Amino acid sequence: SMDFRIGQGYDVHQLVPGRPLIIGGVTIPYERGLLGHSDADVLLHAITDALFGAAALGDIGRHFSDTDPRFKGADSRALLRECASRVAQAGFAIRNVDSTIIAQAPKLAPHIDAMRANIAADLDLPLDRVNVKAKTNEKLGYLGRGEGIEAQAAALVVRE
Amino acid sequence: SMDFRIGQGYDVHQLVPGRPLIIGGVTIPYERGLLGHSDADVLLHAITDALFGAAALGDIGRHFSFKGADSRALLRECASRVAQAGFAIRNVDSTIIAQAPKLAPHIDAMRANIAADLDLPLDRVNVKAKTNEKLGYLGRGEGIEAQAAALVVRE
Amino acid sequence: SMDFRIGQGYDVHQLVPGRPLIIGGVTIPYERGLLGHSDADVLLHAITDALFGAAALGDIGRHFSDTDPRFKGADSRALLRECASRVAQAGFAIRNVDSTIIAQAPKLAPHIDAMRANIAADLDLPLDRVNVKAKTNEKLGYLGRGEGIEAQAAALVVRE
Numbered sequence: 001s002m003d004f005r006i007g008q009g010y011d012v013h014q015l016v017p018g019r020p021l022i023i024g025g026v027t028i029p030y031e032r033g034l035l036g037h038s039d040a041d042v043l044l045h046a047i048t049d050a051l052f053g054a055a056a057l058g059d060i061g062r063h064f065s066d067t068d069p070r071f072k073g074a075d076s077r078a079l080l081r082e083c084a085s086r087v088a089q090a091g092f093a094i095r096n097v098d099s100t101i102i103a104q105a106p107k108l109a110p111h112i113d114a115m116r117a118n119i120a121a122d123l124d125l126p127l128d129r130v131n132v133k134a135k136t137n138e139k140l141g142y143l144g145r146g147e148g149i150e151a152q153a154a155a156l157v158v159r160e
Numbered sequence: 161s162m163d164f165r166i167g168q169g170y171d172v173h174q175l176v177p178g179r180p181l182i183i184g185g186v187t188i189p190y191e192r193g194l195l196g197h198s199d200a201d202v203l204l205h206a207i208t209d210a211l212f213g214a215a216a217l218g219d220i221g222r223h224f225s226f227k228g229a230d231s232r233a234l235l236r237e238c239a240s241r242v243a244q245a246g247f248a249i250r251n252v253d254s255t256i257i258a259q260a261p262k263l264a265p266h267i268d269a270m271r272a273n274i275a276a277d278l279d280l281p282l283d284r285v286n287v288k289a290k291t292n293e294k295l296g297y298l299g300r301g302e303g304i305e306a307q308a309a310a311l312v313v314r315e
Numbered sequence: 316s317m318d319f320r321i322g323q324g325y326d327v328h329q330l331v332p333g334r335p336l337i338i339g340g341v342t343i344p345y346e347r348g349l350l351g352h353s354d355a356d357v358l359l360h361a362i363t364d365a366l367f368g369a370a371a372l373g374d375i376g377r378h379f380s381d382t383d384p385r386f387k388g389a390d391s392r393a394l395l396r397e398c399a400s401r402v403a404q405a406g407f408a409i410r411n412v413d414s415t416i417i418a419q420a421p422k423l424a425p426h427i428d429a430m431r432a433n434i435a436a437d438l439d440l441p442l443d444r445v446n447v448k449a450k451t452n453e454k455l456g457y458l459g460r461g462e463g464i465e466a467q468a469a470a471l472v473v474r475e
């Protein structure tokens with residue numbers, strides 16, 4: 001139809017030795033990893049929040065509590081797929097997703113297509129409606145010092 | 161019709177003693193509050209900027225350099241100027257970033273306030289909240305950030 | 316048509332002595348400037364990213380290598396125009412652009428209308444479809460300390 005809605009999402013996680021690096025469902029060879037409840041997939045969290053926002057359904061925290069047994073130990077791709085099911089049942093179809101990863105290292109460009117493929121699979125979208133961008137923070141802040149990684153997302157949906 | 165536009169907004173304010181904490185028009189009990197020339201409702205400022213941006217009307221600094229007015233009156237006036245340019249608001253989405261206090265119990269009230277100020281049904285307004293994972297000035301409780309996205313149409 | 320897409324962009328550059336300060340294509344008189352391989356125009360880079368992301372064409376680094384000697388000192392308006400040409404080649408028309416600059420200094424209000432005119436010219440848009448906003452970071456973080464300048468952007472396009 002013509003009942004479009006937009007949503008936006010943000011997420012950040014600390015970057016310290018000890019954990020694997022998983023961004024967009026992709027396990028990336030690195031010395032440090034992202035600290036969170038589960039995989040701490042900062043990119044999928046931001047996209048999930050953008051989708052809930054576009055549907056005016058709250059946020060990732062109110063749908064998938066860390067305490068909730070039904071999502072104990074679920075990984076962020078499963079959360080993303082459950083997010084999309086709720087978006088559909090509210091009557092919305094996803095038109096496109098765009099996103100940015102901000103990280104001082106490692107280089108993420110080799111893994112962009114893998115992330116796009118995971119996200120498009122999880123959302124049941126054609127590949128050319130999913131986009132992921134990645135850049136450094138020019139050595140500024142806790143991002144520029146490699147203490148964390150941030151993700152931003154935007155989503156467009158339409159009531160159908 | 162089909163002349164859609166998007167806008168994006170961003171704001172941050174310092175948390176300081178002696179001021180009340182007002183986010184999305186909701187007074188939240190807390191030892192500190194937001195500093196600003198206005199009442200410093202950082203969430204309403206981000207949404208205001210996103211609405212000015214979507215209508216290509218400039219920004220909040222150019223519209224409201226209204227002395228003593230609160231951020232809801234300024235949001236109402238923002239919505240008036242967006243309508244004055246010929247735009248209708250289709251939806252608003254937003255995020256609050258604050259290490260403390262807990263905002264989850266106040267989200268539905270903020271959403272109700274924004275919908276009334278923008279003359280929008282509840283289901284076209286969304287507010288999200290999270291922490292900054294103890295990173296940077298937000299993670300140290302020194303400020304609270306808000307982000308907003310708005311879709312308008314010119315019919 | 317009705318095939319709408321949204322994109323979002325982010326950029327930051329350090330503010331250093333001995334560099335021109337070029338934001339939105341405007342050379343702003345100032346003792347410091349933005350540091351980058353190109354002219355480091357943080358606002359146009361953010362808008363460029365939003366446009367590539369809306370068209371699902373990747374990001375600015377994919378399209379214009381930030382290490383290639385041919386882009387040393389590159390005019391970021393020329394990069395923006397080539398971005399818009401590639402977005403058009405992918406079948407997309409640009410409907411509007413919104414953006415924000417975050418800086419402690421200098422005062423950008425005298426220059427914002429000129430930046431908007433530059434972006435509108437590069438995107439072949441009327442002025443009423445381009446918006447540039449400017450604010451401080453309320454004294455917080457490296458932005459509050461004047462160590463860099465941030466830009467944010469959003470773009471709506473449609474596949475014809």
Ligand SMILES: CC(=O)Nc1nnc(S(N)(=O)=O)s1
Binds near residue numbers: 326352360361377380
């Ligand atoms: C030629 C040129 O400028 N290329 C760029 N690639 N990435 C950039 S960014 N991270 O500053 O937006 S600029």
Ligand SMILES: [Zn+2]
Binds near residue numbers: 011012036040045
């Ligand atoms: Zn997260």
Ligand SMILES: [Zn+2]
Binds near residue numbers: 171173196201202
């Ligand atoms: Zn403010």
Ligand SMILES: [Zn+2]
Binds near residue numbers: 327360
């Ligand atoms: Zn840049």
